[PDB]
């Protein structure tokens, strides 16, 4: 019965209250779920980027936080490193924050969001399908594997 994380996932806590882009929910982790394939994103401590249908994995806990204006931190907690991507494709994470470490998060209108590359605004994050982090040159428009569904981990 417990196979799960913690507390009832299924529920829609403030349906809005007028505050969904402004800070107001980066107060708790956020699970990053993709629609494509229905996989969860989770860094690996060895960096290595990669996802995994277990949403228990404690790991998946990713800590994200709010910057500027449009701009959000990425964090790992047990990994302990923020996410990075680099100049070839390859997406890996480090113990330092470096200035390749943002990313711009576009929210649609179709409830889903897409996370854009700051230092490489040429393409977005995307996983393929079966847990593989996909280049970030094979990335673009089209796949839908940049719609996300992070859930807040509220109740």
């Not at 500027?68 to 907690?77: H, Q």
């Not at 924050?97 to 998060?105: G, L, M, N, S």
């Not at 590359?117 to 089209?142: E, I």
Request: hydrophobic fraction near 30%; charged fraction near 25%.
């Amino acid at each position: 019965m417990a196979e799960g994380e913690i507390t009832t996932l299924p529920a829609l806590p403030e349906d809005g209250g007028s505050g969904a882009f402004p800070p107001g929910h980066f107060k708790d982790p956020k699970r990053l779920y993709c629609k494509n394939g229905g996989f969860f994103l989770r860094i690996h401590p060895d960096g290595r980027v990669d996802g995994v249908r277990e949403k228990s994995d404690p790991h998946i806990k990713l800590q994200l936080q709010a910057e500027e204006r449009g701009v959000v931190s990425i964090k790992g907690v047990s990994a302990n490193r923020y996410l990075a991507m680099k100049e070839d494709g390859r997406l890996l994470a480090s113990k330092s924050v470096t200035d390749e470490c943002f990313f711009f998060e576009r929210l649609e209108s179709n409830n889903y969001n897409t996370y854009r590359s700051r230092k490489y605004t040429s393409w977005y994050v995307a996983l393929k399908r079966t847990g593989q982090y996909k280049l970030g040159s094979k990335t673009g428009p089209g796949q839908k594997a940049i719609l996300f569904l992070p859930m807040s981990a509220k109740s």
